[PDB]
Structure formats: C-alpha cells, structure tokens
C-alpha cells in the first residue's frame, strides 16, 4: 500500500542497462501483473533502443515493442506492460516535466502504470539508488515502496557469486 515488487532479473537488467548507457539516459518497459490495487509485480523488463530525441514517448518504438512482446510470448512470457523504467545517471531519482508527460501517456494506456527511475552512477555496492512513481489522481507525483520478490531457487542461484562467503 502501495508496493512495487521487482524480481531478480528485472533489477539486474535495469542496473546493467543503466550502467551500459552511461553517460546517457536509457529506457525500457516493465513486464508483470497488477496483483491488486496496492500491489504491482514486475517480473521482467526489456530495453528499448536509444533514440536521438532522448527519453520521451517518442523513444517508445512500438514496432520494436510489438516484436519483442511477440517473441517473448513464444517462449513463455506473456505478461502485461505494467510500466516503464529509465535512468538518471548521476542526478538522482525523480520525474522531470518531460517524464511526467511520458508517464501520463502510459497512464492513458493503463491507469495503473508505474514509472521506475534508477541512478546507475550513484548506485554503488551496499546502496541501490532507485524509486517508483505514479501520478497523483487529478500534476504532482508520489513515491511507491519498492520490494524485491525472490524465490528459494533464485536465492540459491545468487549464492554462487561469492560462494566462500556463505
């Protein structure tokens, strides 16, 4: 109330993508399900290509998106777009004027859409800089709590990274 649950691959993909795009902003779509009114589940994400005109509605390439969505469907991933993520490399997590316009477009498609913002430069070991937003219902925005969903199998798989530590 309200909470966005972000899965393991989703977080890692957002960090990986944000870091790779530095010093430019990057953007992509979040997949999952609206569980109830107070709960969004992000199970996966995919990157959108860089476009000249920055991170805006114009960078949402709906051909690429439709193609990706279709190919994901063929391999067992048929989750709804539940929002979008983008990076603010070095300048923290919030929504600019343009970001609010983009979020509004996602809101018109689906009133439950969530905007996730990550800072790949200020994200360091022991501190992930990230936040989730919706627009106030009729233009200000508010933060949602972010939690991480993680199965027992995922936890065990993660434990292989620095094994001699567990």
């Amino acid at each position: 109330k309200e909470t966005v649950y972000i899965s393991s691959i989703a977080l890692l993909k957002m960090l990986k993508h944000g870091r790779a795009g530095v010093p430019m902003e990057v953007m992509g779509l979040m997949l999952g399900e609206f569980v109830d009114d107070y709960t969004v589940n992000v199970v996966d994400v995919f990157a959108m290509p860089q476009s000249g005109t920055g991170v805006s509605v114009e960078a949402v390439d709906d051909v690429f998106q439709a193609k990706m969505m279709d190919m994901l469907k063929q391999t067992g991933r048929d989750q709804m777009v539940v929002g979008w993520y983008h990076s603010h490399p070095g300048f923290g997590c919030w929504l600019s004027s343009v970001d609010v316009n983009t979020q509004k477009s996602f809101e018109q498609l689906n009133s439950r859409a969530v905007a996730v913002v990550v800072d790949p430069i200020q994200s360091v070991k022991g501190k992930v800089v990230i936040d989730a937003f919706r627009l106030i219902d009729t233009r200000h925005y508010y933060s949602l709590n972010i939690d991480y969903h993680k199965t027992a199998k995922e936890t065990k798989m993660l434990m292989n990274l620095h094994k001699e530590q567990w």
């Binding site: 990986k16 990157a47 290509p49 193609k67 391999t75 070991k125 993680k150 199998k153 798989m157 990274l161």
Partner: protein
C-alpha cells in the same frame, strides 16, 4: 595450445536460465534451450547475457528436434540494437547433463557464431559445485567430441551491486 582455457558466467545468465525453465513450466525429462551472449575473442570466454528459444523435442526420439532459425536471427538483431558489444557466442540448455543430440545441435549454432560455439549447461535444479558446465566441440584421436572448460561465476559492478542487494535479508 591456443584453446579457450576457461569460462565466466554472469549471475543474470543463471537467473535468466532459471526463469526461462520456470516460465515455460519445463518438467520431467524435458529441457529448455536458449542462446548465450558475451565475448569469446580471448582464451577466457565471458558469458554476460542470454535469451530463450522456442524448442521442441521428444526423448522418445533422440534425433528429432526443431531449432527455430528465424527466431534466432530476429531476436539477435534486436539484441544488437541494445548492445553491440554482447555477441552471439553459443547456446545453453537446462540439462542437467549432456544429451545425445547436443553435438548435432551445436553444429547448427556454428552458423551463427564467429567463435567455436560455447555450450553452457545450467542446472536449474541445482543438485549437488557450480550449477554450470561449459563445453566447446573439438576433434580428437578422428571424430567430434565436447571439451569440458572450467567455469566461474563473475559479476561486473552493476550486477555485483544488484546481487548484494538481493542477497541482503540473508
């Protein structure tokens, strides 16, 4: 020798293989199959990304299977648009062991890789060391066999940060 000596795998690849296996509800004797991405220009092969493939086989017919060619090309070309540095270096499957058709399947991947294709088996059930086993196809004394390469799990900074964060509360 100038042969590849070892392989490193990113945590994201392990997690991606798992999520693939789980989301297709792969069960019983079946395996899931996909493509791996990264850098194989050196004696250390670095595996840093992956994607799932549609793939059907029956174990009651150990030489019948369908590898979706268009899917590979189409998905790879979208991957290139995001990151040209991560190249198609081979394929993965859930095993948990080598299967009889693997050398044949591996041959088809030669068509898509610049390098000798890396096969990565990710044991998503994680029974009993590392859940990975890595192979390249070679000739020996003369026919074709898989050469087993040692694996380690290694993360770049962003992943290191993500994994540590995920693995708090534990």
């Amino acid at each position: 020798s100038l042969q590849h000596e070892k392989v490193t795998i990113a945590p994201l690849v392990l997690l991606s293989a798992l999520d693939h296996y789980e989301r297709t509800q792969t069960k019983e004797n079946k395996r899931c199959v996909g493509v791996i991405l990264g850098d194989a220009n050196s004696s250390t092969i670095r595996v840093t990304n992956s994607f799932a493939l549609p793939f059907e086989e029956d174990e009651k017919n150990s030489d019948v299977w369908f590898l979706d060619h268009n899917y590979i090309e189409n998905m790879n070309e979208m991957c290139k648009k995001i990151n040209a540095k991560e190249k198609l270096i081979g394929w993965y499957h859930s095993g948990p062991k080598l299967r009889a058709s693997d050398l044949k399947i591996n041959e088809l991947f030669k068509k898509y890789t610049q390098n000798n294709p890396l096969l990565l088996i990710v044991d998503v059930k994680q029974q009993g060391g590392l859940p990975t086993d890595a192979y390249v196809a070679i000739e020996q004394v003369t026919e074709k066999t898989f050469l087993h390469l040692p694996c380690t799990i290694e993360a770049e900074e962003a992943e290191e940060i993500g994994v540590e964060h995920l693995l708090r509360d534990v």
